[PDB]
Amino acid sequence: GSGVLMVGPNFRVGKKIGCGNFGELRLGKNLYTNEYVAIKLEPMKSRAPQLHLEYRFYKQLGSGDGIPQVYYFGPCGKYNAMVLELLGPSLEDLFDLCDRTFSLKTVLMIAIQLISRMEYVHSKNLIYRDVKPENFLIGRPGNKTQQVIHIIDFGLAKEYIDPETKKHIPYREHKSLTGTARYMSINTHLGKEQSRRDDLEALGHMFMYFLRGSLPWQGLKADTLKERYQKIGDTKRATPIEVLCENFPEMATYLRYVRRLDFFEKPDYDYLRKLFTDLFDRKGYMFDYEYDWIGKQLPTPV
């Protein structure tokens, strides 16, 4: 036939975009509306499927602020595909573009939005579990949500409230480590079941990462993943919050609060946001969405 890969009745699959994957994220086009989209692909032969249920997580999330719109899920050649709204570059891409350091203003504008974003996700009975700069993308120049920080990849998500019992998932240990070691919470390092508190702690680690330019456990290597994980964990525990957050009192207060939350406990999202909006106002900053990357030349697939 054609020679061209189609998804559903109107989505033309195009070049693969982004870094790493390996052909799992491709640019696409909606031939019917003449709009570009992002297409996530998973070989039907996959060992550990994640696509179809990530799709289900999106259905459960519904339409939300900062949540990419999902258009289709279906077979595509020897692939299973999920089609979503095309977005802009990730926070990691922007960080590199800004010489690997964000100003406090930029970081606070990011943190205020991400705390709300996480609260939205949690309000849908889901815990994220995959916090990292690569999973947060700004909108597209023009498509009016370019200043909005979006969250992607719910492949590692989990329902923390059992749909039938309506009870919080039970506490337990011995969970295998798979997530990204640089940002994960200390309790995650200990093999404990993750809950709402962990998503928040991970955000904190990321905030300090942006503010300092790096984290003090970032260069640890070992002979086995488990060994690398343990080392990073030991250093996180061995580094006092007052040292990690030197010169950023509010960041220390945030991190101390989340690190001390109980497993079943619902975080006080308003409290955490106010720590940052109070500081923001105190510094005299204006929440005008003028991040550090404003004015630069942004990487784009199209």
Ligand X SMILES: CC(C)(C)c1ccc(Nc2nc3ccc(C#N)cc3[nH]2)cc1
Q: Does 300 bind ligand X (CB under 6 A)?
A: yes
Nearer to ligand X, 68 or 204 (CB): 68
Write the DSSP string, 184-228: --HHHHTTPPP-HHHHHHHHHHHHHHHHHSS-TTTT---SSHHHH
Please, what's the b/e burial string for 236-260 (b: 16 or more CB within 10 A of its CB; e: otherwise)? beeeebeebbeebebbbbbbebbbe
Assigned token pair, 193: 């079941």
Contact between 258 and ligand X by CB under 6 A: the answer reads no
Least CB distance to ligand X at residue 88 (A): 5
- As a whole number of angstroms, the distance between CA 289 and CA 298 comes to 16
Is 21 a residue that touches ligand X (CB under 6 A)?
A: no
The site map against ligand X for 172-211 (x = CB under 6 A) is: ----------------------------------------
Q: How far is the CB of 85 from ligand X (least distance, A)?
A: 6
Instruction: Identify whether the C-beta of residue 66 lies closer than 8 Å to the C-beta of residue 129.
Output: no
Mapped onto helix, strand or coil, the DSSP state of residue 236 is helix
Rounded to the nearest whole angstrom, what is the least distance from the CB of residue 261 to ligand X in the complex?
28
Beta bridge partners of 42: 80
Task: Specify the residue, 81 or 86, whose C-beta has the smaller distance to ligand X.
Answer: 86
Per annotation, catalytic residue among 130, 198, 199, 292: 130
| Residue of 245, 131, 263, 268 lying closest to 197 (CA atoms) | 263
Minimum CB–partner distance for residue 48 and ligand X (Å): 17
The stretch among 213-221, 244-252, 284-292, 294-302 that binds ligand X (CB under 6 A) is 294-302
CA distance 95 to 185: 22
Cα–Cα distance measured from residue 112 to residue 66, given in angstroms and rounded to the nearest whole number: 13
- Separation of alpha carbons 213 and 204, rounded Å: 14
Q: Is 18 in the site for ligand X (CB under 6 A)?
A: yes
Does residue 135 have a known ligand-binding role?
no
Determine the size of the site formed for ligand X (CB under 6 A): 18
**Under rule CB under 6 A, residue 86 binds ligand X:** yes
Query: Which residues contact residue 32 at a Cβ distance below 8 angstroms, ignoring those fewer than 6 apart?
Result: 9, 10
Q: Is 299 in the site for ligand X (CB under 6 A)?
A: yes
Contact flag: residue 33 with ligand X (CB under 6 A): no
**Using an 8 Å Cβ cutoff, are 83 and 72 in contact?**
yes
Q: Which is nearer to ligand X, 145 or 187 (CB)?
A: 145
Contacts of 107 (CB under 8 A, 6+ apart): 207, 210, 211
Establish whether 278 is a catalytic residue.
no
Helix (H) or strand (E) holding 76: strand 70-76
Q: Does 89 bind ligand X (CB under 6 A)?
A: yes
Our finding on whether 139 is near ligand X (CB under 6 A) is no
The region of 17-25, 164-172, 201-209, 230-238 touching ligand X under the rule CB under 6 A is: 17-25
Stretch that binds ligand X, among 73-81, 82-90, 98-106, 261-269 (CB under 6 A): 82-90
Q: Which of 38, 114, 115, 252 binds ligand X (CB under 6 A)?
A: 38
Residues serving a catalytic function are: 130
Q: Which residues bind ligand X (CB under 6 A)?
A: 17-18, 25, 38, 40, 68, 84, 86-89, 93, 137, 152-153, 299-301
What are the binding residues for ATP?
17-25, 40
